[PDB]
Amino acid sequence: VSRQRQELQELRRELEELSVGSDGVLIWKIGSYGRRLQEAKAKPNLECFSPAFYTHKYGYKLQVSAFLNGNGSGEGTHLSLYIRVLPGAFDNLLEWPFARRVTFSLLDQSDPGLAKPQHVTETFHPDPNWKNFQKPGTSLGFGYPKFISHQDIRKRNYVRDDAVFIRAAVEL
Amino acid sequence: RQRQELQELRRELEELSVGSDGVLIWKIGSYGRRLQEAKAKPNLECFSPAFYTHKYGYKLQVSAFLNGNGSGEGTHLSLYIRVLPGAFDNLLEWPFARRVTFSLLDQSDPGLAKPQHVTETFHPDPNWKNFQKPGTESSLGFGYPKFISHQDIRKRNYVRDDAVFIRAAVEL
Amino acid sequence: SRQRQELQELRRELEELSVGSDGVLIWKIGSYGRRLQEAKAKPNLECFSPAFYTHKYGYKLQVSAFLNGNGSGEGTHLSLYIRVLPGAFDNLLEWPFARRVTFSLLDQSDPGLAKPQHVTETFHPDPNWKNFQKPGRGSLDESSLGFGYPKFISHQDIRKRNYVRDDAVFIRAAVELPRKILSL
Ligand SMILES: [Cl-]
Ligand SMILES: [Cl-]
Ligand SMILES: [Cl-]
C-alpha cells in the first residue's frame, strides 16, 4: 500500500515538472466561474491559483493567481490578476532579479473567423528594485487590482461556458 | 476511489498529448494479434491517444480498422480522424478546416534506402458534422476505408517487429 | 494489483513525455556529498539520468555519471557517459546514431553578474561504438555500451567556482537536432 502511494506522489511531482509554458505562454482555464464568483463574494480576498509553471524548460517557476471578486482597490468591483516567482529547481542557473516582460490577458472567447477577439491585455515590466523579483530564499505577488470591471467582463465573451481564460506570456 | 485519482493523472497526461509541429505519430503494436481480433470482430476499431494539433489547439483522435470497414472490409486498412471536445474550443475557428495528411510509414532504414510511405491528404469538409464545433447519423470518423490493401501492406516494411506506424500531419 | 498495473502504465506514459528542450537535457544530481561518499565505498556506483527522447519521435538516450569516477578516472574524477536505449520510434530513424552531443557540467553562477565557466566536451558519435548502433538477441547479454569521458572533471576542479552548489550538480547533455526545412 505504502509503495503504491509513494508511486502516486512521485508521478504527481513528475507531472508538475512538466507544467511549462508554450514559447513562454501559460493559458489558465478557470472553470465553474459562476460558483467561484459567488464564493469570492461571500469571502473577501478569496484567491484562485493557477498550476505552477516553468517559463521555459529549466527556467523560472511562476504561478498566476486571481481574485474573481477583486482585491485592494478592485475589491467587490473588478477581477484582479497577479503573478509570483516561486522557488524553482533550476534557480542557481538563472539571472536574478527576474527581469522578463510579462503580458497578462483575459481572453475574449470569440471565434476568430466570425469576429475579431477583443482581449484585455497589459504588459508588466518588472522593476529591478522590487523585492518580488529577487532570487527565492536569498506572498511576493505583482499585478493588477483593477484588471477588468464586473460591468466590462459581461460585454464580450470573457466568460463563456461558465469559464474564463487567463493568459500569461513571458518574454523568453 | 484510487480509480479516479489515477483517472485525474490520466486526464492530465491526455492534456500533454500535443503534435510535434502538427504531427502525431501513432504506433500500433501487437499488429498480428490485433489483425486476427479485427477479423473476428468487424466493429473492432483501434484508437490513437487523443492529441492537440498544437498547444491550445484542436483536440483530434485518429482511428483504424486493421481488417478494414465499409468498402475496405476484409481487404484494406481503413484510416479515420475525428474532432473531440477540447479544453480550448472557444478560442478556435470553427468548422475545423486545417489540411490533414495521413501516412502509413514504410519502416525501412532511411540510411539504406528511401522509405516509400503511403500518403493521402484532404481539406476537412465544412458539411461534415464532426468538423463543426463540438457540442453544437453514423458515429464513424472521416477518412479512407481503402487506405492500403492487405496485399500492399505486406510489401516493403509497413509491418515491422509486429507494429505499424500511422502519421497524421495537421497543417498549422 | 489493478491500480498497481495502472500506475506502471502511467509511469511508462510519463517516460514517453521525457523529451529534451530543443535537444537539451538538464539533469540535477542532488545530495552530492552523500552520493560521493557512497561512490567511494562502491566503485561501480553509477547515477542514471531519466531516459529522454532527443526530440519528439527521436532517439531515446540516457546520461550516466560516476561521482567518484570509472576506468582511468577512478578515485580522481567525475566520469560522464551517454547511451542509446531502445526507443519506440527506432525503425523510423537513421542508424548508427550520429547526432553531435555536447556534455556540460554547469558552473552555478548568476550569468547576469559573472560569466559561468561550464566544463564542456563535444563529440560526433563514432559509428564503431556498439552502443550507438540500432538497439536490439544472443546468449551474451551485458550492459557495457555507453561512450564517454572517464576524466570529465577532476575532484580538485569540481571544488572550484560553483560546480557544486547547495549540495547539487547539474549535468547538461545537448544533442544536435534534425534541421528545419524551408521552401524558398
Ligand atoms: Cl536577487
Ligand atoms: Cl493544448
Ligand atoms: Cl555545496
Numbering used by the authors:
A (entry chain A): 285 to 422, 431 to 464
B (entry chain C): 287 to 422, 429 to 464
C (entry chain B): 286 to 421, 424 to 471
Relevant lines from the article:
TRAF4 belongs to the TRAF family that is composed of seven members in humans. TRAF4 is a modular protein composed of a RING domain, seven TRAF-type zinc-fingers, and a TRAF domain. In this study, we show that TRAF4 uses its TRAF domain as a novel PIP-binding module. To conclude, TRAF4 acts both as a negative regulator of TJs and a cell migration promoter.
